Amino acid sequence: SHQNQLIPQAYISNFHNRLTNEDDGIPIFTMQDIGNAVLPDLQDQHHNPFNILRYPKIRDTFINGKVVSPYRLNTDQETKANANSGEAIMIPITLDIEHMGHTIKDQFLWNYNDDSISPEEFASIYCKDLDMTSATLQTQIANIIKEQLKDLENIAATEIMSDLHVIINLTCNLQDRFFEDNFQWNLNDKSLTPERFATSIVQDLGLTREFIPLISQSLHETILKIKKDWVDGHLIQDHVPNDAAFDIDELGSNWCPRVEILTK
Amino acid sequence: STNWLYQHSAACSRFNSDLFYDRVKVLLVDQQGLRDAYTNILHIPESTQSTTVLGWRRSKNDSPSDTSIVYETVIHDNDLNKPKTGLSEIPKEIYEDVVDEDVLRAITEQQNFEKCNEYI
Amino acid sequence: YEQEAQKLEEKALRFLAKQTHPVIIPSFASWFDISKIHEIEKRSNPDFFNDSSRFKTPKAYKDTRNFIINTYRLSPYEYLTITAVRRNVAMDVASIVKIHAFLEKWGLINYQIDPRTKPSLIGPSFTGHFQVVLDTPQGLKPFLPE
Amino acid sequence: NYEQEAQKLEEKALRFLAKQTHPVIIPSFASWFDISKIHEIEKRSNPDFFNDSSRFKTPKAYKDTRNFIINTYRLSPYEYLTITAVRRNVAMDVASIVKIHAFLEKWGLINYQIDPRTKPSLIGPSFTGHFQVVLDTPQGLKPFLPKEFPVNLTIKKNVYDSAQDFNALQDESRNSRQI
Amino acid sequence: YSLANFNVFQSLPKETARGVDDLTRMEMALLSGIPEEIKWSLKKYLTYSNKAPYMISLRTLPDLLPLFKTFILPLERIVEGLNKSSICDSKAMDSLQMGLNALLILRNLAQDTDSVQILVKDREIKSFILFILKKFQCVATGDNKWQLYEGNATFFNELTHYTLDLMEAISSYI
Known part of the structure; x- marks a missing residue:
């Protein structure tokens, strides 16, 4: 109960070492008693934090950790009568960067219509x-982000007004697991967003949370591509292959999603 | 040839059962939860966890000057027999004017039941 | 000629019904008819009747609805997810999700099921019952309501 | 009958309940916060999720994201909870993730850096009683029932003699004759 | 004995060991809306304005005046409603006292050049000063429109004084 027995709060950070390790498979930046339990989140330690060290991962966090100074952002000085409240310009961004003896493969979304944060801050x-931390790396990241922003900018801001139904094949690989799915998407109804779709898929298949961004992000990609083919007129609308019984819109229609671990 | 719909439907149900069994095997049977490495933290299906907190409750000790604190958690399940649905969300301007009196009373009962189950 | 196709479909659906389990429809859904629409669907789910596209038509809507209801009733003790229906139905995923959520709201799809069969995301646990401690300008004080 | 039902329900609820080990400390001005509700301060500081401007920004999405971040921090309050981990787990646009993370960090709700071994402990006015935090029952654990059935179970209990014992999370069980 | 006895915990700075610098604490406390934090922060701000006004000058710390204005304008409404018994509740008394404290803080800061320069460029504060002065004139000339209820005189008294001091300062800039 003594003052000294307490533990400081929010100083350590073992994140980088979790990135580097191979036992912890992160697809980015690579080169009583305990049963089959790894973390103490559900097993009650008998009001003694020392027992927390029975688990190798907590020990790794407490031994190979660094002290971290916090972010100090711009205190969210929002704007003066800005943010005209357009819906969204959601464009995906990928990063393939070869630092000295290090790879960086990453993905995320970016709202082009929101000028609250800048690519340099995100790079930092x-x-x-x-x-x-190295200014060269941050400059490379910012330039890549700006290029990918300028490329897909005008295309993303094109609202479709005529009903289009397209058969879509999603294929996403995390590190070694491949997720493949086929479905029929309508590019006019703003009811369902790719995020909700990805959440439903991950719930039903029982995958990890890490698949929720990835899938959705890749979906966005395909949509944009289709928009290009519909701006250049190269997109036909006469037929769409969905296995329908005899008219259209019937009960066979397609295959289903699957997740497979591959090699070679 | 009157057996096609039934076969597709049965295949759908079998697919559903397979998915359920696979989820239960991966997430809850083999190990209790999946340890994610980005945050170094367990992940268990949100169903097993509780959602919100329905206020608090407070009382007194048995004797005066008995300066002790009894902290304890409690779950509350008003009418565990009747399940909850999204019926507390449908506006009145939809189901009204086309309904039987009894169905209207049932709708009102369900909505009030959910709203009251959101309380302590 | 088309009357014969209607006869075929009717006999198929009758066979489906003749090989389905008995379920307990809740009271607040008694307005539902397997062979009708009832104008509650028309209001709750528009755009199936505005002739918006060649695809979303009231006939296909009714067919999908009946198919989903029967696929559930084949085994009422299990939550019917969207992936299976999506596997065996031709329509935009948005409309499938609309119909699924609609039929769920009125207890027509997942009213009485084994609650262990409902899928849910895997986030971290729920730290709502935890004990918080305020940091007053003087000292650490146990946060407790009044 | 129902006795065994409630017994199994208590067993399952206690098995899948997050056991607290480390104490969480937040500054006093962050006392308006509730994990299950949204406050006016959150709607003023984040007007984009509630002004109905976009479809990707809904109050449900904001609440789910902030609850994910809060739970992740509370489960291990000694680490720092970098933004990249959250971004890898959550599926929002990076700008919104950053805004929510910064907002939660400003009010000390997460990443509040102290060294709690240099301050005294006091007693508030509200004290010396039985406190029952009543949280909703989890689904997927309710019994399978193929008359009413209310439930007011009690999962786990903890007793403390002083406020310092409450802060240090030291129960009378082990504290009695520790060494 | 304690997990703090790791080498990693041997390099902590002295700036965070307390948790939050008191300026940030007072600002966030005013931002919250909890009455206890409001009163604590207002007492501390008043002490600082009296014994160290260069640390909270309205120039080095922008967006400080808006909070005081949020505490001061309801004081205008109350003073308009001050010609009858209208402080029956404790929330009314708390709002009145917060307004008086914010007004005294503003006056103490206005005793400096930069702070009064920032105060002059504000239509709200000047309009409030004019409103209080017109109420004082109505009391002085003995008008039958607005007659101060003596049960409140005390409050009004303090009010008037602060206002005049403010006027004095800004009198150089008009």
Whole structure:
């Protein structure tokens, strides 16, 4: 109960070492008694934090950890009568970067219509998290983000007004697991967003949370591509292959999603 | 040839059962939860966890000057027999004017039941 | 000619019904008719009757609805998810999700099921019952309501 | 009958309940916060999720994201909870993730850095009683029933003699004759 | 004995060991809306304005005046409603006292050049000063429109004084 027995709060950070390890498979930046339990989150330690060290992962966090100074963002000085409240310009962004003896493969979304944060700030945050601070890396990241923003900018801001139904094949690989699915998507109804779709898929298949962004993000990609083919007129609308019984819109229609671990 | 719909439907049900069994095997039977490495934290299906907190409750000790604190958690399940649905969300301007009196009373009962189950 | 196709479909659906389990429809859904629409669907689910596209038609809507209801009633003790229906139905995923959520709201799809069979995301646990401690300008004080 | 039902329900609820080990400390001005509700301060500081401007920004999405972040921090309050981990787990646009993370960090709700071994402990006015935090029953654990059935179970209990014992999370069980 | 006895915990800075710098604490407390935090922060701000006004000058710390204005304008409404018994509740008394404290803080800061320069460029504060002065004139000339209820005189008294001091300062800039 003594003052000294307490533990400081929010100083350590073992994130980079969890990135580097191979036992912890992170697809980015690579080169009583305990049963089959790994973390103490559900097993009650008898009001003694020392027992927390029975688990190798907590020990790794407490031994190979660094002390981290917090982010100090711009205190969210929002704007003066800005943010005209357009819906969204959601464009995906990928990163393939070869640092010295290090790879970086990553993906995320970016709202082009929101000018609250700048690519340089995101690059600084990312490099601080990876613990690889170097102005050259941040400049590369910012330039890549700006290029990918300028490319897909005008295309994403094109609202479709005529009903289009397209057969879509999603294929996403995390590190070694491949998720493949086929379905029929309507590019006019703003009811369902790819995020809700990905959440439903992950719930039903029982996958990890890490698949929720990935899938959705990749979905966004395909949509944009289709939009290009519909701006250039190269997109036909006469037929769509869905296995329908005899008219259209019937009860066979397609296959289903699957997740497979592959090699070679 | 009157057996096609039934076969597709039965295949759907078998697929559903397979998915359920696979989820139960992976998430809850083999190991209790999946340890994610980004945050170094367990992940268990949200169903097993509780959602919200329905206020608090407070009382007194048995004797005065008995300066002790009894902290304890409690779950509350008003009418565990009747399940909850999204019926507390449908606006009145939809089901009204086309309904039987009894169905209207049932709708009102269900909505009030959910709203009251959101309380302590 | 088309009357014969209607006869075929009717006999198929009759066989489906003749090989389905008996279920307990809740009272607040008694307005439902397997062979009708009842104008509650028309209001709750528009755009199946505005002739918006060649695809979303009231006939296909009714067919999908009946198919989903029967696929559930084949085994009422299990939550019917969207992936299976999506596997065996031709329509935009948005409309499938609309119909699924609609039929769920009125207790027509997942009213009495084994609650262990409902899928849910895997987030971290729920730390709502935890004990918090305020940091007053003087000292650490146990946060407790009044 | 129902006795065994409630017994199994208590067993299952206690098995899948998050056991607290470390104490959480937040500054006093962050006392308006509730994990299950949204406050006016959150709606003023985040007007985009509630002004009905976009479809990707709904109050449900904001609440789910912030609850994910809060739970993740509370489960291991000694680490720092970098933004990249959250971004890898959550499926929002990076700008919104950053805004929510910064907002939660400003009010000390997460990443509140102290060294709690340099401050005294006091006693508030509200004290010396039985406190029952009543949380909703989890689904997927309710019994399978193929008359009413209310439930007011009690899962786990903890007793403390002083406020310092409450802060240090030291129960009378082990504290009695520790060494 | 304690997990704090790791080498990793041997390099902590002295700036965070307390948790939050008191300026940030007072600002966030005013931002919250909890009455206890409001009163604590207002007492501390008043002490600082009296014994160290260079640390909270309205120039080095922008967006400080808006909070005081949020505490001061309801004071205008109350003073308009001050010609009858209208402080029956404790929330009314608390709002009145918060307004008086914010007004005294503003006056103490206005005793400096930069702070009064920032105060002059504000239509709200000048309009409030004019409103209080017109109420004082109505009391002085003995008008039958608005007659101060003597049960409140005390409050009004303090009010008037602060206002005049403010006027004095801004009198150089009009």
